């Protein structure tokens, strides 16, 4: 209301946990200007089928460990949103052959195991790197170390293992991935092994909306957000920054100033052109942008007439082994979530994702009857009634679904995405310390993007030092 102003670019989980923080501290002349006609960002429900079912984020990830997840009171306590624990330890009773059914539970049993022993020894190895990245490798590399074979898991069985341990949880294959950043995951490491799959009717997102509602004022009556600090439809474009303030151009022409401005949007949109900043960044920052990766987490959502799969015990994730890696290769059922629905989720990642986003509903439909038919001979599988196919990465708002780091990137380049330009801030859980590529990553994220910007505002200590 009087004091600095600063311009929140971005309503998603890291924007709305941003302003909050700033709030908190007094900074309370915030704009928040989001590009869509929602907040939320990528936790984001929709109706499919008659049911809500998520776009985008769908667990929370790391509970039950020596620290408490943020975001885990939030949905279990405060909210109550309609939750379950993931189970994974029946994999090996569930991985179809690509023509012919199941694989004997005992056959897959050692194959997973070996990957585990594989991966445990990329743990132990990771633990010994030095900190300056200087002698990282990829995934893969440690894979090829501990195997003595040029190359890592090249088989249907195995690559559909190793598919499910890495791509299925980082949305690329280990060959891209940094093996010092992501094995073990600081993620699991911190807050825990276990994994909560959302199911509410209310939506992943009612967390953004519940932290959004702490100092954002809501109708008495509708529980709305009628706050004007926050403008729906607000695409930015333009970013002008001077050592004396900063300007923020929308695409339906308005200009406004402000002290700062907290830049949220994905790394995916940085790497694209809709924001433009004048001046334009320099090479450090703009190098950083462009050799962090975005990801694509494409969760195919289909209808059925009739179930014609598995249910019970253990049945609830399985795998088809093509000879084809990463094709239609992790399943989902949802007899516990959504009862009597008759729904899969098969989901797809990286290459497949921006072929499958491009290629009508109608063919990928096709695709996955074809599979489905072969996982499943000599039981009448009937045509899906409907598909979605989300299409995060087609999306200008988006273009991906989160970030995942790359082999070659070290912790003070990493460190650099974050820092601020000026009066420029940056936000997002691409910016998250250990947390990348996580929901509570950008609630975290949003809280130390705050706290450098009121440190700048309030302390005067301005100059940002890279690590
Ligand atoms: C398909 C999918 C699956 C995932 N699964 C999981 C999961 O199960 N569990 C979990 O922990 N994490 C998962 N995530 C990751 C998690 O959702 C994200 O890390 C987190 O929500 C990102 O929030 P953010 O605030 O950093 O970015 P965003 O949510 O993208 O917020 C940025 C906001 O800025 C807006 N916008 C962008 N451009 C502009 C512009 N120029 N003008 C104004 N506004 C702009 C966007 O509309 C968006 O609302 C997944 C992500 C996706 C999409
Ligand atoms: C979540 O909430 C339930 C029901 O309130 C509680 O009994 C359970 O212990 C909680 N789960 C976790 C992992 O904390
Ligand atoms: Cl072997």
């Known amino acids: ?186 993620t699991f490491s911190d807050f825990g092994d276990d994994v909560y799959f959302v199911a509410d009717q209310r939506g992943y997102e009612a967390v953004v909306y519940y932290l959004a509602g702490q100092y954002l004022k809501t109708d008495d009556k509708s529980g709305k957000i009628v706050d004007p600090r926050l403008q729906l439809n607000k695409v930015v474009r333009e970013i002008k920054y001077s050592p004396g303030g900063v300007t923020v151009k929308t695409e339906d022409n308005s200009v406004y100033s402000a002290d700062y401005v907290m830049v949220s949007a994905s790394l995916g949109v940085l790497q694209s052109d809709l924001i433009q900043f004048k001046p334009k960044l320099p090479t450090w920052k703009v190098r950083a942008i462009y050799q962090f990766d975005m990801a694509v987490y494409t969760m195919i959502f289909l209808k059925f007439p009739r179930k014609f799969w598995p249910e019970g015990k253990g049945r609830e994730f399985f795998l088809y082994a093509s000879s084809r890696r990463g094709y239609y290769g992790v399943w989902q059922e949802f007899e516990k979530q959504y009862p009597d629905a008759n729904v899969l989720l098969v989901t797809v990642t990286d290459e497949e994702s921006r072929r499958i986003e491009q290629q009508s509903d109608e063919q990928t439909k096709a695709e996955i009857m074809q599979v489905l038919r072969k996982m499943f001979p000599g039981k009448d599988v009937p045509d899906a009634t409907d598909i979605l196919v989300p299409r995060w990465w087609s999306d200008r708002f988006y273009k991906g679904t989160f970030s995942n780091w790359p082999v070659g990137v070290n912790r003070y380049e990493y460190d650099q995405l974050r820092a601020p330009v000026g009066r420029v801030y940056f936000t997002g859980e691409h910016t998250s310390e250990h947390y990348n590529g996580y929901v509570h990553g950008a609630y975290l994220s949003g809280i130390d993007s705050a706290e450098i910007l009121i440190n700048c505002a309030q302390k005067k200590m301005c100059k940002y030092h890279v690590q």
Do not use: C
């Not at 975001?71 to 306590?77: K, L, T, Y």
């Not at 994999?91 to 056959?107: F, I, R, S, T």
């Open 1 to 186: 209301t009087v004091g600095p102003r600063v311009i929140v670019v971005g309503a998603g989980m890291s924007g709305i946990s941003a302003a909050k923080r700033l709030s908190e501290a007094g900074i309370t002349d915030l704009l928040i200007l989001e590009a869509t006609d929602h907040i939320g960002g990528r936790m984001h429900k929709t109706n499919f089928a008659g049911i809500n079912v998520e776009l985008g984020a769908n667990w929370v990830e790391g509970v039950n460990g020596g620290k408490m997840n943020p975001i885990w009171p939030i949905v279990n306590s405060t909210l109550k949103l309609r939750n379950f624990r993931s189970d994974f330890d029946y994999l090996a009773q569930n991985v179809y052959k690509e023509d012919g059914g199941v694989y004997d539970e005992d056959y897959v049993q050692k194959r997973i195991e070996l990957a585990d022993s594989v991966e445990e020894m990329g743990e132990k190895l990771s633990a010994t790197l030095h900190a300056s990245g200087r002698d990282d490798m990829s995934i893969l590399a440690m894979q090829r170390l501990n195997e003595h074979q040029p190359n890592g898991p090249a088989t249907p069985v195995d690559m559909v293992v190793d598919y499910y341990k890495f791509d299925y949880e980082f949305a690329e294959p280990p060959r891209v991935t940094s093996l010092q950043n992501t094995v073990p995951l600081a």
